Design a protein around this ligand. Structure first.
Ligand SMILES: Nc1nc2c(ncn2[C@@H]2O[C@H](COP(=O)(O)O[C@@H]3C[C@@H](COP(=O)(O)OP(=O)(O)OP(=O)(O)O)O[C@H]3n3cnc4c(=O)[nH]c(N)nc43)C[C@H]2O)c(=O)[nH]1
Ligand SMILES: [Mg+2]
Ligand SMILES: [Mg+2]
Ligand SMILES: [Zn+2]
Length: 354
DNA sequence: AAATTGCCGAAGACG
DNA sequence: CGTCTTCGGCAATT
């Protein structure tokens, strides 16, 4: 049965071809625009991210994530309160000076200009039906809506790229030592880290100047290199069911979110974070044999439910950042989700049949 | 130095 | 399952 669900979740190449062709055209055009000329974003480079490029996108290739990353040398980070994830950016006749607010590089000012330029360029596109979605307060994304004629959304994410050592709140994160190993962990942590203009929610409003850490590049690597054995899922190695379990859990949540508005606070990143923890807890590829899909999915569900119950789901890269804090998600919402998941779990997952 | 190019891994399609 | 294919990511090389 789970196999049948995975078959239906599996993307079709025809859909992939048609969607990628249009998405690539639109993005290539926006990127070229940024790169020329007298703009503060001139040196941005593209990094494709999220579920489509990690091969865990489900049902249809109808949502694409892409970062336009700007390398910003000599930036100084000040942790926003003790959040671990959120930062004020300051510096040691540059283009980003327009976005200053004191010594502080305002995420909001910079994102607003970035968004302005995207919109202007989108207006110039005549051969493709593309519009930009209304702004969502606090979000780092400029979201495009493409009609291909089928609906495809594309999040363009501005990011700052810093080549320095990662902020200390990440020091005991990425606990992959017994799974992917020490060389991998050390090498990953020598790569750049990113900041996206997602504002910290502070009480009733957002702090407009704040940025949030992003490890999209590291996560992409992990998804593509996820076995304790180097040949995991390769042509001369054994297939595991790690990604299949992730797809099923994402589907379960998507389906539940579709019919209950009280689940608005939950997102796929919660599921992705949960399974990162599970892959740490069960590092052996033998624990993710396709023959044991049902059992791996069940263990993931059990862990997720325990996260809910204990109101604790630590960010995988930033252990003191609790995604399931009361500040972020009300206890009642988490109890609501537990009930719905337990029900589906206890009754053969009827929601999988649409 | 911006743009093209092939290489080959991941995984869909098909029998 | 094996073989075929397309798309993405890389970086040399123009
Ligand atoms: N590259 C990137 N993009 C980030 C990001 N953080 C947020 N984004 C982009 O912003 C929008 C909205 O952000 P959000 O915080 O308000 O809500 C995100 C949305 C979902 C997952 O979105 P996704 O990026 O598209 O993930 P997929 O892996 O592609 O999965 P699908 O469901 O299959 O698409 O989760 C929320 N969320 C909460 N916390 C998040 C986080 O820390 N990182 C991410 N990526 N999402 C997070 C979403 C996205 O386009 C970031 O760090 N890097
Ligand atoms: Mg996505
Ligand atoms: Mg998205
Ligand atoms: Zn694998």
């Amino acid at each position: 049965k789970l196999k049948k669900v995975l078959d239906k979740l599996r993307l079709k190449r025809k859909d992939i071809s048609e969607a990628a062709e249009t998405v690539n055209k639109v993005v290539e055009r926006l990127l070229r625009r940024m790169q020329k000329r007298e703009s503060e974003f001139k040196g941005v480079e593209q990094l494709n991210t999220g579920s489509y490029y990690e091969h865990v996108k489900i049902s249809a290739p109808n949502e694409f994530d892409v970062m336009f990353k700007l390398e910003v040398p000599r930036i100084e980070l000040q942790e926003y309160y003790e959040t671990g994830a959120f930062y004020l950016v300051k510096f040691k006749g540059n283009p980003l000076s327009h976005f200053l607010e004191g010594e502080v590089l305002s995420a909001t000012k910079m994102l607003s200009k970035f968004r302005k330029i995207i919109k202007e360029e989108v207006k110039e596109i005549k051969d493709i039906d593309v519009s930009v979605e209304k702004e969502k307060p606090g979000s780092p994304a400029v979201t495009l809506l493409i009609r291909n004629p089928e609906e495809i959304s594309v999040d363009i994410i501005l990011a700052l790229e810093s080549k320095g050592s990662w902020p200390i709140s990440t020091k005991e994160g990425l606990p992959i030592q017994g799974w992917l190993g020490t060389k991998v962990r050390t090498n990953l942590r020598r790569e750049p880290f990113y900041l996206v203009p997602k504002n910290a929610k502070d009480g009733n409003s957002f702090q407009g100047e704040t940025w949030r850490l992003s490890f999209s590049h590291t996560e992409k690597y992990i998804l593509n290199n996820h076995g304790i054995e180097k040949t995991c899922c390769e042509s001369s190695g054994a297939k595991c069911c790690r990604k299949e379990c992730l797809k099923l859990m994402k589907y379960l949540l998507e389906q539940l979110k579709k019919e209950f508005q009280e689940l608005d606070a939950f997102c796929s990143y919660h599921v992705k974070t949960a399974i990162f923890h599970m892959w740490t807890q069960d590092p052996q590829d033998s624990q993710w044999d396709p023959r044991n899909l049902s059992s791996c999915f069940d263990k993931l569900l059990a862990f997720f439910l325990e996260c809910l119950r204990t109101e604790k789901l630590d960010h995988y890269f930033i252990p003191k950042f609790n995604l399931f804090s009361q500040e972020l998600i009300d206890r009642k919402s988490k109890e609501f989700l537990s009930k719905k998941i337990e029900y589906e779990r206890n009754n053969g997952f009827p929601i999988f049949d649409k």
